[model samples]
Target: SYTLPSLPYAYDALEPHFDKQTMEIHHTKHHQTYVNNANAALESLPEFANLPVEELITKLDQLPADKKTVLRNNAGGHANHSLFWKGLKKGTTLQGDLKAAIERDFGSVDNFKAEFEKAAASRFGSGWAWLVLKGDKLAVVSTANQDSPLMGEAISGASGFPIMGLDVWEHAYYLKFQNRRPDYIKEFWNVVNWDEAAARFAAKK
Candidate 1:
């Protein structure tokens, strides 16, 4: 069982890059369901009762079938959405290690975004596009629905660190762009918090 963390900024703080109503609904409504289910899926199982919410993703394979399946889905949703919320800000610049790594690994920030946007756009269904670190290596990858790389070897077939993520599900953008997902994907960069990305990069490496 876990509690929802208040957003780092006001629902309308991400205006222009992200809309007000969508932020309200996405956090309070959509994300709340994931938070509720993540808590409900557990019944004081000692295996999970004391772990922090994020750690649950790393321990998924050790759980029993009923709780395992439920945690995989719901815990995955909560962890992904929680990171999704933190991954954005009103404005930020790519600096420090993340900036250098983006340039070195993906050529340039724009080049990195070209593939990142493509990953989000090409999913064909609800999913997420992630910027992850495997030791010193950085990569762009996508997972279907609420699945996350944090599921690690248990499901993603790999493990290490997730730096940034974008929610490409229709629920993430439908209100603002209807079916114009490409537009939403493009707009996402406007609110992306490069500061947060840089911090995460520094932490993992």
Candidate 2:
């Protein structure tokens, strides 16, 4: 059985920003379903089962054409949701090099939030907005559908290691922000786990 990752904070902890019902459904229903399907897709194929999810995603072109779509959708969903969970916290703040980088690159933390929110709000459909590390620079990008930066060459544009991401899918925020995606994007900053994101950045370096 695919295990649902527990929220770092109580469902209502992000209240007003994110509704308890939306968090419950997104985590327990959507993300869990993806994990279950991903595991099921690889269970009988031992050759792929033992490979790490990230490795599988990064090598999508190598997978048999018959299994490519399954691996792409479910594996991408698994990877995306995994990072999404780590990207949030109750009261974490940015500091150290990460803080300096944000200030230097985006002028200030609030500015970074504003730009990120704009990028998320501008997404045309179900997708994700990302803060990713390419070489030594930080940049923002979006992926349509369940695709992630980890898909590497199979993905369009320049792929970099994703340091953080926000799910802009309606299933992720509709119950809380309704059709007001900008409102949801604005609320996302209140719960960002900069420490976790910093760790991811350092790992890529």
Candidate 3:
């Protein structure tokens, strides 16, 4: 059953830094809707069923023209939101090779944050800001709407292994921060899962 995965932490676990109300709505309402629609989109195409979201997304070109659009958006929604939830964990610090890479690539951790916040804040509309592997180097990039780094060049401009991402969609933060997106972006460092991000970067290597 392709259903919403239980959040790895209590909804209130990220409180103060990230309000329980926002986390609850983002996880239970937004993410679950994506999961439900994603399953429905793939119902007639058993051949593509059960493939990992990464595989399914990359192979979207194989689906018939009529079936492709719904599957592409819904599946990408499922995959991105799934990763987005796990991308956060309370109290993680940048460490190991990920730390070194940040130093080497962006000069310092502070510089990296400036760049990341710029990417997240400057996104024209609803989208995501990401730290992704472009070749052997780390790069900050953004994708619009339900698109993600997993979708490759087929659906959007995203074409790299995403180590981490922050959703810039208003639905992600408007309740608490209202129109202050930059403030919301600034507060995101409080819960970034550097462990999961490092594992992704290390595995990509």
Candidate 4:
């Protein structure tokens, strides 16, 4: 019921900040596996076979007891990675309402980056760091494994619309940054597609 979303740019488009090989494998192998797994789980659950990945994660508890976990992990994987690819680009900068919101919420853009980077680097395991709009306020949060903020607080312990997010899984950076996750988090700013983030912010607000 789901398919892997393609990168909007060339494999090496984010070069220096994100290498070609890593991007290729991450998109083709890791993300594809998630899509495939999610589809497999959906096959036996006709009720959710057509739900969008974004909504599927939010409907976990409503699924059959035996199939909930598989669907949750893989569906969340698909949703998170889909958002991940949409948020990558080189040369984009933060501006407009999203920028103003960051300042209003976190005191300054640098402070927001500090909080975001800290969330990414301190995740402790495979997970994600996100800038989410909770009601009228923005917050920096992280979720374990493939859990998504869109999964609702019952499942992810946080609920919001993620305006921007970073995958901190080892497969997201292991080939290049290896053990230095913080370095990968630092370089992420160089390629973050803030224009898309701003658009998300504007639409959600």
Best by TM-score: 4
Query: Candidate 1, clashing residue pairs?
Result: none
The number of the candidate with the highest lDDT is: 4
- For 80-147, candidate 2 gives per-residue lDDT tens digits of 89789878876777888887877877898888877888878888888899897876777778888788
lDDT tens per residue, model 4, 13-69 = 999899899999999998999899989878877779888889888889999898889
TM-score of every candidate: 0.94, 0.91, 0.95, 0.97
Overall lDDT per candidate, in order of appearance: 0.84, 0.81, 0.86, 0.90
Worst 10 residues of 4 by lDDT: 1-10
Query: Clashing pairs in model 4?
Result: none
Order of models, best TM-score first: 4, 3, 1, 2
Could you tell which candidate, 2 or 3, scores higher by lDDT? 3
Q: Could you give candidate 1's per-residue lDDT for residues 32-97 as a string of tens digits?
A: 888888887776685686687778888787898768777777788888888888989966988888
Poorly placed runs, candidate 1 (over 4 Å):
none
RMSD versus native structure for model 3: 1.2
Evaluate candidate 4 by giving its C-alpha RMSD to the native, one decimal. 1.0
Where in model 3 is the C-alpha error above 4 Å? none
Instruction: Show model 2 residue runs off by greater than 4 Å.
Output: 156-158
lDDT of 3 by residue, 111-175 (tens): 99999999999999888999999888888888988888777865778789889999889999999
